[model samples]
Target: VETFAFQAEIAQLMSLIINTFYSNKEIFLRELISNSSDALDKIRYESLTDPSKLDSGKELHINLIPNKQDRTLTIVDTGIGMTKADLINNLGTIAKSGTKAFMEALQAGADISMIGQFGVGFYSAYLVAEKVTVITKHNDDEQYAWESSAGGSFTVRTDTGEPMGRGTKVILHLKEDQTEYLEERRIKEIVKKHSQFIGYPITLFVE
Candidate 1:
């Protein structure tokens, strides 16, 4: 297992984000959905110049899985995933947005205004979740898990969970007081309010 500490300012920024940044914690889903949208955009864009981007051959989509018994909300996406280095660079160090970087790199978006937001917005999960874990697989790299308890450090290790083909799954351990997100209706409302415009299909695993 490999571990890394947050950048000099990330820990401090996270504390602020968890406690005071967003007035409504519901936006956590929006940010994650938006990020997933960007990942979707990325793979679609990459596939144009390089067909191998689609060799894994999963339909593009997003899923929200809430486990009441475990109190965890998982956001899964079948899009461009990160490598081990990506997990460290994006989540542990510099406030970087892979989407923004991709946009700049390929001049991918002037119209992508809908997706790009705060680079470090992922930290917003701490607003409602005490711990977060990301399981991801990249076509070129082995699947890996990046996890943290909203602490100063996080660990990245080879993923031993189910094979995810190629994509990302972010699982949030919701705080006791923030169980509202576990409700199917609440999640549907949040999606309608903040993520309805998203072009990709977003599914919730529910009864």
Candidate 2:
């Protein structure tokens, strides 16, 4: 497995967001759902230009799986998977306009519930998770697993799992005190509140 460090300042901002700014942690669910929605849309758009991209005829869905046994929450999207470079940029780089401004606002003592507006939405995972694993397979790239423990560097390793033909699976190892997120009723309530009208797909529950 190859490992990479997050951009220095970005890492600091992540610490702030994860440890300092987060209040209503439930927004993490909304952010994840919206992100999966975007990924699904990306595949749909790409297929319009190249029908072969969807030749596999894979059915797309945004799946949420919560496991109380292992204390993990997994979100899956049958959407356009990320290349290694994409993984590095999206999570590691905070140069995006959204994150930069959001960081500033955060320091200014704003309890902004609009965390999803900025790129820091993904970092919301750390609000309740101790670590995260991203398993993705792109049409042009081999499957890979990217893992980070919410502090500094992250790792990338080749994966042979057949969970998805082309798309992403993000697994969050929830913090011990954050087991409340594992409740199916709680997750359904959060989805209904934040993304009820959004493009929701099937949610799978694993005991």
Candidate 3:
């Protein structure tokens, strides 16, 4: 896998993205889940050409699990997971972000929101997380793991487990201040708020 940085133009805006905007932490999970759903849409669309590429065993759903004592929250989905190259391309380079392209298209005249624009959504995980871990399995690639502090560099490795069969899982290591997210009630409220209209189902758990 390869690694790189935001282009000079996009890097110049990092300070603004890191400091001034995104006041609401809950919005982070919502955005990431939305991206997951979009990834699912991508595979579903592709499945028209290759019907074998699907999570036929699991129904699509976004799940939230908050561990109060551990200060961790995990969001899992029955959507497409990242392969080794996907992790490098998607998380490493700004160019690989679908949201970036969607936004560019919108700015060029397509109608859309900031959600489909800017790659800020995934980074939103940092809003409430001190660290983040993503475990994923893709249809044609081996399972892999990615972890980062959201400070600078992240690490990637391979993982062995029951295959995801299909889908992705995002584990958020919550910040001290954001521990309230561990509450099932809070998660449910937030899920219902931002994702109630979502085409897929969302589930919340506490343990």
Candidate 4:
């Protein structure tokens, strides 16, 4: 496991987010689903111009699985996943919206938009989860897992979890005070209130 500390400023930023940034912790699901939709859009765009790049039998969708026994909630998406460098630059660091580079590529004829333009949404998970684990498989890279507790440091390493095919799976270890997020009805209401209009299908595992 490779570990790295967050920049001082970024740690302060995370503390702020955890303590005061989001007024409603449930919005974390909305933001995460939005990010998933953006990733799905990206791969679809790529496949449009070069169908050969599309993975076989991969359908775009998001899955939400809540395990009360484990006190964990997982969100998975069949979309473009992240490489190890991406996990570091995107999750380990802060405020670097890879969006600018993505926009530049778009201008150069790559037809895509809707990537995480503001990079901050992913951190929203910390509002309700004490520890967050991200397992991802990128088309160009091997699967890897990234984990953090919204603390000063995070770790990344080759993942031994179930193969993701080509997508991302984020497992959130909910805080004791955040147990409401593990309730199916609560999550459904939140999704309906905040993420119902997402472009991709979101399925929640109930029972």
Candidate 5:
């Protein structure tokens, strides 16, 4: 397993987002679904030139599974996934538009909302999840799992579980105060309100 520490300013930024942004916790689901849509768009664009990238079939979609027994909510998508490097660069640090570069921009009067524009919206999951685990398979790389509690660091290693074919599966272990997210009705309402026009089909399953 490889471990990495988030940069000082980056960690501070994360703290603000995680702690100060709880009022909009429901938007965390929306942000994740939006991210899934973006990833699905990426794979579709890449498939235009190379048909082999679509390992899961042409019928693209996102699956939401709410498991009350495990107190976890999972979102899976048939889309572009990250390799070890991508996971580290993307998740380990805020390397969307360059962490330090963005930090400098923020210090120099850039709007803080730019963080969302840079794709760091995935961290919003920390709002309601005590832990977030991502199992992903890319066409060019083997499957791997990235797990973290949004501390200063995260973990990455080979996933010895079921093969996900090609896509990304994100599991959120709900926090005690966020149990409402595990409800079928709540998830459905959020999906309809935030992702209704998302191009691909969104399926919700209760387990």
Candidate 6:
């Protein structure tokens, strides 16, 4: 098990992502898509030793679907999914983020983005989403669903249906103010700005 710890400064970082880094709020989708891509990369890198983990193949992809009527947005991926424990650690607290390293890289008096090694990025989703649900199917274990309300508490349950065919699906119950994010042009612009270089095929969903 990876020993997990959240630094004392993590709270400040969380506040920043919520109150500062995300002034626009719409960046939630971009941050999520980027994190999903990172998840795929992580598993692919690990699969270098255990080959079956990559049963889903090498191409990474992302897709988005918006339900403007319901004020919800869904993002799907064909990347390595997380098991229950993975969800707890990944979603609960960022594991071994380079927050400290990133901070130390700057001189004591230097001004840099206050990024730290932690999972606070996941919290970025809350900037726009009032509620978030994550359904993940890991090749190594049974499927699991994680639900959260951005206010901190979350619930995890064993999935009933066949595991998602080797990847993850995330649904965002967006806040009323974030309805604009459901638009294709805005979401497309965010994707291109934050994830254009991401090694994955990203699709825009418009209703």
Q: Pick the candidate with the highest TM-score.
A: 2
The residue ranges of model 2 lying beyond 4 angstroms of the native Cα positions read 90-96, 204-206
Clashes of 3: 1
The CA lDDT of each predicted structure is 0.81, 0.81, 0.69, 0.79, 0.80, 0.69
RMSD of each: 6.1, 1.9, 4.5, 7.0, 2.9, 4.7
lDDT of 1: 0.81
lDDT per residue (tens digit) for residues 94-202 in model 3: 5446545654664586432254356556766766777888888888788888876644456677777566777788889887878878888888888878777777777
Question: What are the runs in model 4 whose C-alpha is more than 4 Å off?
Answer: 21-23, 90-117
**lDDT tens digits by residue: candidate 5, 1-207:** 888776665566667666763365777788788888988999999999998877566767899998888989999998888888888774545453455655577678764445556566677788789899999988879899998887788888999999888889999999988989988899999888877899899999876
10 residues in a row with least lDDT, candidate 1: 109-118
Better of 1 and 3 by lDDT: 1
Off by over 4 Å in 1: 21-23, 90-116
**Candidate 6 to truth, TM:** 0.75
Give the TM-scores of the predictions, in the order they appear: 0.86, 0.92, 0.78, 0.85, 0.87, 0.75
- Any runs in candidate 5 off by more than 4 Å, and if so which? 90-115
Q: Tell me the TM-score of model 1.
A: 0.86
Candidate 4: pairs in clash:
none
Off by over 4 Å in 6: 1-22, 46-51, 56-59, 90-119
lDDT of 4 by residue, 1-207 (tens): 999887665676567567763446776888799889988898888888878656633588999999999999999998888888878875545454443454455457643222234565676788789999999988879999989997799899999877778888999999998988889899999999988789888899996
Winner on TM-score (4 vs 5): 5
